[PDB]
Design a binder for this molecule. Sequence first.
Ligand SMILES: Oc1cc(O)cc(/C=C/c2ccc(O)c(O)c2)c1
Ligand SMILES: Oc1cc(O)cc(/C=C/c2ccc(O)c(O)c2)c1
Ligand SMILES: Oc1cc(O)cc(/C=C/c2ccc(O)c(O)c2)c1
Ligand SMILES: Oc1cc(O)cc(/C=C/c2ccc(O)c(O)c2)c1
Ligand SMILES: Oc1cc(O)cc(/C=C/c2ccc(O)c(O)c2)c1
Ligand SMILES: [Fe+2]
Ligand SMILES: [Fe+2]
Lengths: 497, 497
Amino acid sequence: LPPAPRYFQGENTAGFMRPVRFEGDITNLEVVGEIPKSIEGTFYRVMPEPHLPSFIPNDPWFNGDGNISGFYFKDGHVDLKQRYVRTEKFVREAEARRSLLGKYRNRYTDLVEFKIRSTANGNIVYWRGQLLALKEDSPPYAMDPETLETFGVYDFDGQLPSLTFTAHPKFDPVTREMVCFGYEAKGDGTRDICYYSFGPDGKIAETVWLVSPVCGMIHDFAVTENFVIFPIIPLVCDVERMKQGGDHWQWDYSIPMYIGVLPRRGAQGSDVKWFEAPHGFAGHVANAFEDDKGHIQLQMAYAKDNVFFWWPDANGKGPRPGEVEAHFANFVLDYQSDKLPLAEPTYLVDDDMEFPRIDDRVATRKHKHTFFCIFDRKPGVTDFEFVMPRAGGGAPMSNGLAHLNHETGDIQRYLPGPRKLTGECIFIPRNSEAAEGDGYVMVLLANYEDMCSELAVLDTKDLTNEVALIKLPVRLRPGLHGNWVDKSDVDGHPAPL
Amino acid sequence: LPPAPRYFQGENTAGFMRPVRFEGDITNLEVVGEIPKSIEGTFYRVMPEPHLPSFIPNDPWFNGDGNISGFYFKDGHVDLKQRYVRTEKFVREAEARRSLLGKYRNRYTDLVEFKIRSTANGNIVYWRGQLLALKEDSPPYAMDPETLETFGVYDFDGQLPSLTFTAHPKFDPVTREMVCFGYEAKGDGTRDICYYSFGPDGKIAETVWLVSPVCGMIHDFAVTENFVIFPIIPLVCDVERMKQGGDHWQWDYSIPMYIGVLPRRGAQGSDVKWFEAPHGFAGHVANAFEDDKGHIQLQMAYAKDNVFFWWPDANGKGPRPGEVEAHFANFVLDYQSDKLPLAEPTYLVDDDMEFPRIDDRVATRKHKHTFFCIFDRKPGVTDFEFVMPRAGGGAPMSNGLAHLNHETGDIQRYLPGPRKLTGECIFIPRNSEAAEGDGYVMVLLANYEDMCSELAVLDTKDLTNEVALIKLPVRLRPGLHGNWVDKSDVDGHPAPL
Ligand SMILES: Oc1cc(O)cc(/C=C/c2ccc(O)c(O)c2)c1
Ligand SMILES: Oc1cc(O)cc(/C=C/c2ccc(O)c(O)c2)c1
Ligand SMILES: Oc1cc(O)cc(/C=C/c2ccc(O)c(O)c2)c1
Ligand SMILES: Oc1cc(O)cc(/C=C/c2ccc(O)c(O)c2)c1
Ligand SMILES: Oc1cc(O)cc(/C=C/c2ccc(O)c(O)c2)c1
Ligand SMILES: [Fe+2]
Ligand SMILES: [Fe+2]
């Protein structure tokens, strides 16, 4: 076998990116300021965190074993519980005490044959009394919300029709449906997309098989009252390249950014329309909704080049680190239109941004508040001379949050400080009567001065001010998505506005 | 109640002394170099680590909740398990989410009435299939060696005759007895010492009640073939002072360092002889043995002033931090002598030292190897300008280990580096046939550059060289005692030479 390294090496595991790999508990976290006593619930987040050194050099951040953090809040006190998802990969590698899974989404490089290759490191959502740890090449892994025990691969009582389940299902706050899809839904290199949904009772509702024009990456999607929308990143998969040891994904500069639109209920596969947006990178969706005219307003991060620059085109053409900005775009789509090309989007703000969140009580409907990460290159905002030697590589950087009020156009910006960076935020309604976007924002900070993590609590009345700063004595490696599960919500999801 | 702080403040919890308070697992620790594959067993150590901020300002290091680390070795791989002892204090404070126990060994300052005030933070030893977490004001807490679960207060099947059990029992390698005592054995301020022992079958053997000349601190003791030996630190307890909120301990410059000698088997309390060594501080015992003449050679750390300077005399007189050195002393005692005053000891080395270990296969018998912590003020050995601002306070500092060969007088010194300090080492026999003092030494390092801990593995053939350096991504706060439990030893203790 290729030798197994016994310590981590390379920039992707240096500095603040160095794996800690702890599982367990830290109760009664230290708090500067005061956590509002009325906050009750749990912030779950997932980070990629390799449990064992990879035999693949410069293994991407996206390929690390998913480790779940839960921050449990009650009466102004907070406890941390942390545990790895017991994926097939995690368990077999733990047994062997060495890495066995190879390159990202390339089974031809694995040292053993895996049935499930999930690292379960994309998202951690709540559904019908379980956590689901998501990874878009795999079914979910189900976990216990209280103990973070892994139950195992979850197939929705034998109903799951797809080999793959998106990291970005949407929760309809009115119907209480979980709306889902998977791409490469019949395995490596397949252009099959399976669109499917589950009612609040756990029974499958929709199942529609459609066909993508290319085998392209569909990381996120959007859901409106009457439509589902599939933006395709121009990363394309060729299995013959993979069999020779090559990358799953390769940029294609010659294609549009396809945006498929399908009727949400009762459709056939042939009902999809593949609109063609200008070439670019489909980032995370804030939210989509139908306006008065029945037109889809799709609000999402959008870049004009390959954000995932480590997967360039066939000739190695692509951007350098830190070069590509994504902007908060609005696309207008009309399902009734026969014109496939779409105009350039309008932009809601100037900021280099990503990881947009809304008040999910209006998900799939018109929203007027968005919270998002920003990266401001303006001199002084980040002390790069101090931070970059301590940062490692392989993960995106955010040096603030912004709150856009879409009606007034007012923006507030939270800057944690020149030697701190942020992850994706969560929004918490102040209470069950709170107006849209009124409540608390929490975000995990990397503090490069202390080389510790912190959890900031902000009030939406003034996003510039920390109400509380929870001071962890360990590092939580930069992670991906996370979710709030409020104690007042019996099914784990907030009530509609 | 006095207010409960919600974050740690003061020098005793600053820098590397800041509590982490993690419990759980980190498997497959990163390793630089190579752990000898034949090493099989577990290194257990205990640190004081306050679970909650104290309502007592500048609470001493000795008053922190005991947290147990286990480093489990097999086939050159190592896993960490970490868990707090579930003392009465730990559990009640966890339930309340605030500190309730008050000043060190002063129940009159507690916010609730405790039955057992143990922090179980002094030592962690193996006995008849359990760990015993020791604290000299209390009985032991029994724990599971594999899971570190706490079973509860341990009273040896109802046989424990004393309220108190020393942090420093001795294991006789020939008889397989655990030889024990407790001072203040009938409660606060009592001069009762209870000497007791347990045979390898768990049955109590000796129980002898004796009377100390003063109510002084007897932190450690020594055992030979035919005698047990009780050195008294001139810290003295007055319960009336304690009832007014004063300190348990107060130095007395007017008394000798008493050294009691009692026949090991069949004695009455009146058989003790209280020899009178020159005034000074009784540090940790390396080992004691009887020579050819039947005279006791007692080898221990010994200082000429109050090492515990935060407990000065009645008029507040005593040394400053970093002023008092302890030296490796040899005292000669003759039980048959009627002369009580003892000569000044001879000194085996000149180093400022503490935390001596021997090859416990010759415990209670003549030894010719000692391993110990040293603090060398020689320019450059420690980079104080870098270290001291990051160090915090309240704990002793060691910047190397030394190995003394008592026959040849040769000393080897291990220096981890200018920005690292050490804890107490353990010795591991190379194998069951190894000569005395031949095998491995392990020691936990504080790395102030990384603000991480590391576990160094040394071969006694050359103590200056690390064969392996195990790199923890967290800090383990400076701790006290620890022990090796070898897999090849059925009763957890090594076979006699
Ligand atoms: O030694 C082996 C051989 C093998 O062929 C499979 C396994 C483990 C399978 C597994 C363990 C945990 C999971 O969560 C999961 O999806 C799969 C272990
Ligand atoms: O900074 C960004 C921006 C973005 O729009 C998407 C991502 C992550 C996508 C992803 C893609 C494949 C994976 O396997 C995975 O875990 C995550 C990260
Ligand atoms: O009056 C009370 C009230 C209470 O809420 C708890 C206790 C004691 C609990 C305890 C828990 C664990 C231990 O190991 C132990 O010795 C004691 C006593
Ligand atoms: O650096 C030193 C030198 C020494 O000779 C003894 C000690 C520790 C003694 C101790 C005394 C009382 C306690 O309650 C406790 O946990 C520990 C520490
Ligand atoms: O006359 C003295 C007395 C003393 O106590 C220390 C020094 C110098 C210390 C030193 C010099 C160089 C270093 O790199 C370093 O860590 C420490 C000089
Ligand atoms: Fe995502
Ligand atoms: Fe001790």
